[PDB]
Design a protein around this ligand. Structure first.
Ligand SMILES: Nc1ccc(Cc2ccc(N)cc2)cc1
Length: 438
């Protein structure tokens, strides 16, 4: 493959290459590779090479920083000063951000260089990345399939080797699902651990909502861990895990509210037997597991209120504030349920989604889509079940590649750890990957 973000940084810091050559190589890969993929839909190449020269002025003057001169892109829905943030809305094509987002400001502070931004579905509301401003992003592994969404272009740029680092957002699996579909690494972070300032509905500038998070995306866990330390509000607890021996794993290949294809089950199951072969204690049932079906209903109820900003259609009565406060009480009760579960487990292993990447759908209404699972059509939206646990209850959740299905399409494993243990999620993935090579 290509240089990782850390390897790029270290090459720039040893002499092997200049930030501006690094920036020009990335530009080269994007132009040579993005034609059929359409992942880098906002390009800031001229300014990017200026800041690359600026980065080289620093290196020539003794300066070092963990990402100095490292080229990267970011999800279109995160503000970069001077660049559109439209979220795919035609009405906001020309909404130009005035201020870097906090994530961007943080990575810029660490010396990174921003070449542009990556494609998203309209309103960040799909497991595909398609919109009238930029068009559609195609899975580098099979151009007839979805790149995932809403962070789909991010994952596709990573998978195609264009840039070593990205940063996405997830309120309904939009980091994990595209990483899963495209065969790269994506970390949904603990709720409220990373600032969403600059991840603004276009032309707004308010408070972060419940549920949603931003987190990094990369080709490897080392880059994720570094990107996390550079962007979290405060420094998060370092990884306590340094071996799979004795690691306690809750393996969930069933969900009461969604099916999984047998290839996906096999992939996740194999990742767990592989860990076991290194000492892990793998369980398949526990009485402290919260009601996953009630969880899906509570999460969905709250997801639709959040996305609608508390509004309801004409004739329909909105939720009262007090009822909303009751919904947060419910959410807190469920969260305590997982606190008790993590007294007995270090991680949950489960699918990210019940299928690998599906063929492009032009059907806007999820209720009219299907997904083929084990040869039969099943409801498309049911699959939110798999990503509901970590979003609703706040936990960090890694999506990492662990296999390919029979058509060559990536399959990812979801690793859920306890709140604030984001670095243990990443570290356990790193160890799953060693174990599967063994
Ligand atoms: N038709 C329809 C129904 C439900 C949703 C919720 C949602 C789904 C996926 C993501 N990544 C974010 C939000 C979006 C569209």
């Amino acid at each position: 493959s290509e240089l990782s973000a850390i390897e790029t940084a270290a090459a720039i810091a040893g002499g092997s290459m200049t930030a501006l050559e690094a920036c020009d190589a990335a530009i080269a890969r994007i132009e040579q590779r993005d034609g059929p993929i359409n992942a880098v839909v906002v390009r800031d190449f001229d300014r990017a090479r200026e800041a690359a020269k600026a980065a080289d002025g620093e290196v020539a003057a003794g300066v070092s920083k963990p990402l100095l001169g490292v080229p990267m892109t970011i999800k279109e829905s995160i503000d970069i000063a001077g660049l559109p943030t439209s979220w795919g809305f035609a009405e906001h094509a020309d909404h130009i951000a005035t201020a870097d987002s906090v994530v961007v400001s943080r990575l810029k502070a660490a010396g990174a260089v921003f070449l542009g931004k990556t494609n998203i579905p309209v309103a960040l509301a799909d497991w595909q990345s398609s919109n009238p401003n930029y068009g559609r992003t195609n899975n580098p592994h099979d151009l007839t399939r979805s790149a995932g969404g809403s962070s789909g272009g991010a994952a596709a740029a990573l998978a195609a080797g264009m840039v070593p680092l990205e940063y996405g957002s997830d309120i309904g699996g939009s980091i994990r699902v595209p990483a899963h579909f495209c065969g790269v690494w994506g970390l949904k972070t603990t709720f409220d651990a990373v600032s969403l300032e600059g991840h603004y509905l276009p032309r707004t500038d308010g408070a972060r909502g419940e549920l949603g998070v931003v987190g990094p995306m990369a080709r490897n866990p080392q880059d994720l861990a570094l990107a996390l330390d550079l962007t979290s509000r405060i420094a998060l607890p370092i990884a306590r895990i340094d071996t799979l021996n004795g690691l306690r794993i809750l393996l969930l290949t069933h969900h009461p509210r969604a099916a999984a294809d047998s290839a996906v089950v096999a992939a996740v199951e194999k990742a767990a037997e592989s860990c076991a072969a290194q000492g892990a204690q793998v369980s398949t049932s526990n009485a402290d597991l919260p009601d996953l079906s009630k969880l899906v209903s509570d999460y969905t109820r709250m997801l639709l209120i959040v996305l609608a900003q508390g509004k309801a259609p004409e004739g329909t009565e909105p939720v009262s504030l007090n009822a909303w406060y009751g919904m947060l009480d419910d959410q807190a009760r469920t969260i305590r349920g997982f606190d008790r579960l993590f007294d007995s487990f270090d991680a949950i292993f489960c699918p990210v989604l019940g299928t690998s990447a599906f063929p492009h759908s032009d059907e806007a209404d999820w209720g009219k889509r299907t997904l083929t699972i084990d040869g039969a059509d099943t409801p498309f939206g049911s699959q939110l079940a798999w990503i509901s646990m970590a979003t609703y209850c706040g936990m960090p959740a890694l999506s990492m590649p662990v296999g390919t299905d029979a058509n060559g399409l990536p399959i990812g494993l979801q690793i859920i750890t306890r709140n604030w243990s984001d670095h243990d999620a990443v570290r356990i993935g790193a160890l799953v990957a060693d174990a599967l090579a063994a």
